[PDB]
């Protein structure tokens, strides 16, 4: 049964609610983004209207085989009427195709559902600038002040400079980047651009990337692994055993691997600056964990909420324990007392 924080009151709508069977009263199912915890339950046998971005609808049709007649893609930044209710989709600064949803309820209430997002000051000049929000359904993934990490631009600078130095020292080094979902494509694209290479990958991953409307993508990626010196592998293979096994398959073209694991936050963020990050090394294999987040830091989240000034907040992440819920509620009250709303 569908939980309350996935239902939009005063509508027939749900958000990210595909794993509960037929939800009573639901006339349109919204999907914020193509990540498996959110699409859990969708397949080619789904027969109710799904509303989403264009990129999410390309993934639903090609990867999950949802039939076309049930996919309803909406443009961003554009007022649309769905089943008698005005909605707008906004860029969530998460993975490709990820949106926030503004719902203008028939009674005058305005609701923002963030989906998953990485808050940014640029969102203060979207269509949110123009009206009041009563209810905020908030991605609270990192809602605690211990969760710190650098900008995506600082992380990419580190990755490019590390890869360029290694390969210039040793032209026979291979670079490997781990992946297990969409998102974080700038890591491997930025590294392949500084090295003058296409990115090599499996047919299954190539197919996924071909759905993302990235400009000039045919110039940037390939299934011909022998032509590429930046390879993508499943995240599970990014360990010394898996990397050794991969290096054997490359037919003596290479004699060293430099590998990247984009994680979110890890506890080494509480001590080490991005500049000072070092790898784990075994023989001719080195592995860097890099803190590339597609979720708000605590400070980014707090800034957004203090600007928006919602009347009520409903968390959508960390909702399963009393301790997490009490912690989040204390920070919401702090923020409100500090800013005066
Ligand atoms: Ni996500």
CA–centroid distance, 295 to ligand 1, in Å, is: 8
b/e sequence 111-131, b meaning 16+ C-beta within 10 Å: bbbbbbbbbeeebeebebeee
CA–centroid distance, 300 to ligand 1, in Å, is: 17
**How far apart (Å, rounded) are the C-alpha atoms in residues 75 and 85?**
16
- What residues pack around ion ligand 1 (CB closer than 5 A)? 35, 116
For residue 290, the surrounding DSSP H or E stretch is strand 285-291
What's the DSSP call for residue 335? Answer: H
Give 268-276 contacts, CB < 8 A, sequence gap 24+.
269/147, 269/148, 269/149, 270/146, 270/148, 274/150, 274/154, 274/155, 274/158, 275/158
b/e sequence 6-41, b meaning 16+ C-beta within 10 Å: bbbeebbbbbbbbeeeebeebebbbbbbbbeebbee
CATH number at residue 65: 3.60.15.10
CA–centroid distance, 36 to ligand 1, in Å, is: 8
CA–centroid distance, 179 to ligand 1, in Å, is: 14
CA–centroid distance, 116 to ligand 1, in Å, is: 5
Report the structure determination method: X-ray
Domain identity same for 140 and 8: yes
SS3 55: helix
Domain identity same for 46 and 163: no
CA–centroid distance, 318 to ligand 1, in Å, is: 14
Torsion of CA 181, 186, 187, 190, to 10 degrees: 150
Domain identity same for 191 and 206: yes
Domain identity same for 12 and 84: yes
CATH number at residue 262: 3.40.50.12650
Domain identity same for 132 and 143: yes
CA–centroid distance, 196 to ligand 1, in Å, is: 31
CA–centroid distance, 33 to ligand 1, in Å, is: 7
Domain identity same for 189 and 108: no
Query: Smallest Cα–Cα separation from 232: which of 196, 203, 274?
Result: 203
Domain identity same for 300 and 172: no
Confirm if 221 and 201 have CB atoms less than 8 A apart: yes
Cβ-Cβ contacts under 8 Å for 313 (sequence gap 6 or more): 135, 136, 138, 305, 332
CA–centroid distance, 93 to ligand 1, in Å, is: 11
Domain identity same for 109 and 46: yes
SS3 152: helix
CA–centroid distance, 151 to ligand 1, in Å, is: 18
**What's the number of domains the chain is made of?**
2
Domain that holds residue 250: 148-295
DSSP 155-205: HHHHHHHHHHHHHHH-TTEEEEEEESSS--HHHHHHHHHHHT-PEE--HHH
Domain identity same for 186 and 313: no
Domain identity same for 133 and 94: yes
Domain identity same for 302 and 327: yes
CA–centroid distance, 35 to ligand 1, in Å, is: 5
Give 20-26 contacts, CB < 8 A, sequence gap 24+.
22/48
CA–centroid distance, 169 to ligand 1, in Å, is: 37
Q: Is 159 left (phi over 0), alpha (psi -120 to 50) or beta?
A: alpha
CA–centroid distance, 167 to ligand 1, in Å, is: 33
CA–centroid distance, 95 to ligand 1, in Å, is: 7
Domain identity same for 64 and 169: no
């Amino acid at each position: 049964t569908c939980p309350f924080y996935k239902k939009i009151p005063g509508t027939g709508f749900t958000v990210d609610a595909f794993q509960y069977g037929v939800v009573e009263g639901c006339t349109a199912y919204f999907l914020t983004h193509f990540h498996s915890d959110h699409y859990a339950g969708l397949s080619k046998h789904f027969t109710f209207p799904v509303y989403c971005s264009e990129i999410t609808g390309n993934l639903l049709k090609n990867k999950l085989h949802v039939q076309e007649q049930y996919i309803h893609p909406l443009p961003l930044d554009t007022e649309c009427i769905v089943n008698g209710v005005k909605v707008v989709l906004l860029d969530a600064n998460h993975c490709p195709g990820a949106v926030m949803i503004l719902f203008y309820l028939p009674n005058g209430t305005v609701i923002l559902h963030t989906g998953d997002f990485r808050a940014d000051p640029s969102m203060e000049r979207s269509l949110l600038a123009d009206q009041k929000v009563h209810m905020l359904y908030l991605d609270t993934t990192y809602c605690s002040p211990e969760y710190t990490f650098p900008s995506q631009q600082e992380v990419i600078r580190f990755a490019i400079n590390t890869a360029f130095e290694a390969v210039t020292l040793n032209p026979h080094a291979l670079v490997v980047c781990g992946t297990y979902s969409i998102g974080k494509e700038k890591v491997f694209l930025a590294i392949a651009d500084v090295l003058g290479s296409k990115v090599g990958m499996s047919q299954e991953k190539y197919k996924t990337l071909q759905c993302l409307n990235i400009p000039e993508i045919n110039s940037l990626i390939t299934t011909d692994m022998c032509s590429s010196l930046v390879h993508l592998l499943p995240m599970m293979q990014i360990n010394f055993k898996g990397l050794q096994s991969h290096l054997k398959k490359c037919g003596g073209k290479y004699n060293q691997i430099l590998a990247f694991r984009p994680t979110g936050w890890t506890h080494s963020n509480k001590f080490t600056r991005i500049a000072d990050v070092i790898p784990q090394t075994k023989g001719n294999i080195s592995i860097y964990g890099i803190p590339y987040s597609e979720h708000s830091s605590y400070l980014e989240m707090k800034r957004f909420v203090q600007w928006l000034k919602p009347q009520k907040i409903i968390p959508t992440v960390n909702v399963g324990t009393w301790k997490s819920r009490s912690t989040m509620e204390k920070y919401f009250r702090e923020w409100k007392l500090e800013a005066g709303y």
